[PDB]
From Swiss-Prot, chain A:
Entry's localization field: Nucleus
Keyword entries, A-Z: Nucleus, Proteasome
This protein's name: 26S proteasome complex subunit SEM1
GO biological process, one term: proteasome assembly
Tissue distribution of the protein: Expressed in limb bud, craniofacial primordia and skin.
This protein's GO CC annotations: cytosol; integrator complex; nucleoplasm; proteasome complex; proteasome regulatory particle, lid subcomplex; protein-containing complex
Signal peptide segment: none
Protein family per UniProt: Belongs to the DSS1/SEM1 family.
Swiss-Prot record, chain B:
GO CC aspect terms: cytosol; extracellular region; ficolin-1-rich granule lumen; nucleoplasm; proteasome accessory complex; proteasome complex; proteasome regulatory particle; secretory granule lumen
InterPro entries associated with the record: PCI_dom (IPR000717), Rpn7/CSN1 (IPR019585), Rpn7_N (IPR045135), RPN7_PSMD6_C (IPR049549), TPR-like_helical_dom_sf (IPR011990), WH_DNA-bd_sf (IPR036390)
Subunit structure: Component of the 19S proteasome regulatory particle complex. The 26S proteasome consists of a 20S core particle (CP) and two 19S regulatory subunits (RP). The regulatory particle is made of a lid composed of 9 subunits including PSMD6, a base containing 6 ATPases and few additional components.
Keyword Repeat: no
Recorded family membership: Belongs to the proteasome subunit S10 family.
Sorted UniProt keywords: Proteasome
Alphabetical list of SMART domains matching this protein: PINT
Gene3D superfamilies attached to this UniProt entry: 1.25.40.570
Protein name from the UniProt record: 26S proteasome non-ATPase regulatory subunit 6
Transmembrane spans: none
GO annotation, biological process: proteasome-mediated ubiquitin-dependent protein catabolic process
Annotated PCI domain residues: 184-352
Curated annotation (Swiss-Prot), chain C:
Organism: Homo sapiens
Interval of the full protein contained in this chain: 141 to 209 of 418
Its biological purpose: Component of the 26S proteasome, a multiprotein complex involved in the ATP-dependent degradation of ubiquitinated proteins. This complex plays a key role in the maintenance of protein homeostasis by removing misfolded or damaged proteins, which could impair cellular functions, and by removing proteins whose functions are no longer required. Therefore, the proteasome participates in numerous cellular processes, including cell cycle progression, apoptosis, or DNA damage repair.
Protein name in UniProt: 26S proteasome regulatory subunit 6B
Family stated for the protein in its record: Belongs to the AAA ATPase family.
UniProt subcellular location: Cytoplasm; Nucleus
Assembly and oligomerization: Component of the 19S proteasome regulatory particle complex. The 26S proteasome consists of a 20S core particle (CP) and two 19S regulatory subunits (RP). The regulatory particle is made of a lid composed of 9 subunits, a base containing 6 ATPases including PSMC4 and few additional components. Interacts with NR1I3. Interacts with PAAF1. Interacts with TRIM5. Interacts with ZFAND1.
Curated annotation (Swiss-Prot), chain E:
Stretches that traverse the bilayer: none
Annotated protein name in UniProt: 26S proteasome non-ATPase regulatory subunit 11
Coiled coil segments of this chain: none
Record localization: Nucleus; Cytoplasm, Cytosol
UniProt tissue specificity: Highly expressed in embryonic stem cells (ESCs). Expression decreases as ESCs differentiate.
PTM description: Phosphorylated by AMPK.
Top-rank taxon, per record: Eukaryota
Organism lineage: Eukaryota, Metazoa, Chordata, Craniata, Vertebrata
Job of this protein: Component of the 26S proteasome, a multiprotein complex involved in the ATP-dependent degradation of ubiquitinated proteins. This complex plays a key role in the maintenance of protein homeostasis by removing misfolded or damaged proteins, which could impair cellular functions, and by removing proteins whose functions are no longer required. Therefore, the proteasome participates in numerous cellular processes, including cell cycle progression, apoptosis, or DNA damage repair. In the complex, PSMD11 is required for proteasome assembly.
UniProt induction comment: By FOXO4; expression in embryonic stem cells (ESCs) is mediated by FOXO4.
Organism from which the protein derives: Homo sapiens
Similarity remark: Belongs to the proteasome subunit S9 family.
Cysteine pairings via disulfide bonds: none
Amino acid sequence: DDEFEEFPAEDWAGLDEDEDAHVWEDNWDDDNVEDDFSNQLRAELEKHGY
Amino acid sequence: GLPKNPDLRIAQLRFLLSLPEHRGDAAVRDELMAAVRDNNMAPYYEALCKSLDWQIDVDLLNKMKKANEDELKRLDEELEDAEKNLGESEIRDAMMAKAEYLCRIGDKEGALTAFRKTYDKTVALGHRLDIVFYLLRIGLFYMDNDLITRNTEKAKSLIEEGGDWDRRNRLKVYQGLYCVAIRDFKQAAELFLDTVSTFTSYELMDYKTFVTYTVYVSMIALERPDLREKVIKGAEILEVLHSLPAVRQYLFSLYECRYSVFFQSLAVVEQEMKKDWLFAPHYRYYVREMRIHAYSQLLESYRSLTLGYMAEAFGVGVEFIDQELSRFIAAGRLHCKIDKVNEIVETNRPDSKNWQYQETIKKGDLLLNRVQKLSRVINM
Amino acid sequence: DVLPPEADSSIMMLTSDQKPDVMYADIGGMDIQKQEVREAVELPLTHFELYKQIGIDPPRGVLMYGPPG
Amino acid sequence: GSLLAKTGQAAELGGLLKYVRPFLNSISKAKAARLVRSLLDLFLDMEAATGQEVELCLECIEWAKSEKRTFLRQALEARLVSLYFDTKRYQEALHLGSQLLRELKKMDDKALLVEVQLLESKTYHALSNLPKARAALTSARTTANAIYCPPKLQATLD
Amino acid sequence: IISTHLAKLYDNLLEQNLIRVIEPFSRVQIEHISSLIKLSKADVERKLSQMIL
Ligand SMILES: Nc1ncnc2c1ncn2[C@@H]1O[C@H](COP(=O)(O)OP(=O)(O)O)[C@@H](O)[C@H]1O
């Protein structure tokens, strides 16, 4: 039993936090950055006049 | 089971003061009004982050904590030293009073130590059920998802097997693990529509709050199969929507498929979920998943619905719906394409044969990956 | 081979379930007692879990020694 | 009281009801109790002071409780359950009906129980609580078998 | 049980009228369907949708 350290074993040097520390399953679209939807709908209501 | 429920309230108040900075004036008031009470000094190492390091009650409040904790500690010492009561005796409840003092007054560390001590000491059915409930409640208090999973695993495995008619008193918070997590789609609802509460208004802060969780979970679950015969037929469901008109408003809006009021109410739902510590689907399943179900419901039974008219039938801002459709198609759902040169939504709904055959070839891909992995397992 | 169905071997009636003939409160006899009968239906109406814990021993056989009344 | 109802007066009838209390506690309990009920029903009939009808009757119930006329105060509680259903009250009518049922089932009244159960069935239907309405209605029938010819009540059940 | 049943009955006639006039057509323009039913376009489209969802 060997760990195959011959291949470059660059362990992740952060050791600070787990971003998804829980069992949450992420998606490619789930991690986009926006002001959610409530603010966007408010802006949509404003540009239409109400 | 009443304890740790007002503790849940202060935990939610700390959430409302910490994560959303918009609530920084009223959140301070409710946090202070419930932290000067309830003896929040040991449970104030978390509270010091938002407000000052310590509110100006230090001398009086700490004396109350130390005196109360010492009195219970003296009581515990008397039972465990002067009397040799062991096993099935009153020492079991004496250590429950110790754990209650270390939980309701002291920090969670002492309460957890007291719990784990008597859990390993006595394994009686009633005692084991009560402590599992307390461990779950303190776990959902301090947001230790590891502790919530641990108590849920043992309870669903062996603890709930021994003893019945108490699982009906526990699933409402045993499924809270799925409620706080992303899994609000299938497993949550299937074990959470049960309207058998262990108390009239407790655990999840109310029966009304219990319903709001039911409505949110059901809305994430499904769009419009015979849900009229699943939740709408529910008499207690109709009654509580009479109690909450706004909650009744969007639930009927989704049922009636009237998008003009739905989106405004859906945004209100997302804003309400923002003020709730069960905010895990922050960018996935507040409004995007529900409208994915709604848009799928809308564009199905349609072939080419114009962007301009579907925009006014689903709010305003033709460009806003156009960019929303493009984003969601790129996400994968909303099975359709956009004819930009003519501004048309040409859907592509596969037939019952076509869509299902697509599902089989996908599962064929996954299982070929499985058997190839198993072919790796053999011959080595 | 073994036959799964058992009711039709000698007829003697069959599954009368899933068919509303006389629902419940529509009976003209009101109660007579009908509380021991609802006690009898407690076991079909789940409550076998409530038979334990609560420590009751639910009834098993109900004999009605009455005329066609 | 008959002329006040005929004319439609409210303040005068309210003052008369608040004034006749010495005479109520000088005669037969049943006769005084039914006189109170008749005057209260006549007052609540025409003039719709929704901000005063509930408060006035609650005061009468408190007065009846002070006089220890249990059957009187129970009757007015049933009347306010009916008034609550008339005003589309959500759940305060429900607990009041539940409180009435607990107080009345220990007794052996029959007319009040049928009215309470029927009112409970009505408010379930108003809140669209069909299965509980059916269960309450079935209990209403089981209680209503006692009265042989309540010509108004039998129509209400039907 | 007055507005609710009248609305329920109104839905019944809408469904019956649509189903009665729909057998011949393999593909019919919806403004023609509205003309036969003597109604507007949005309400007929909304009713026909709610039936088919
Ligand atoms: N609502 C009702 N209440 C009481 N009896 C009824 C009602 N409806 C019908 N019946 C009668 O009850 C009878 C049952 O008869 P039967 O089964 O022969 O009596 P037994 O069960 O004693 O042999 C039927 O013949 C039917 O006419």
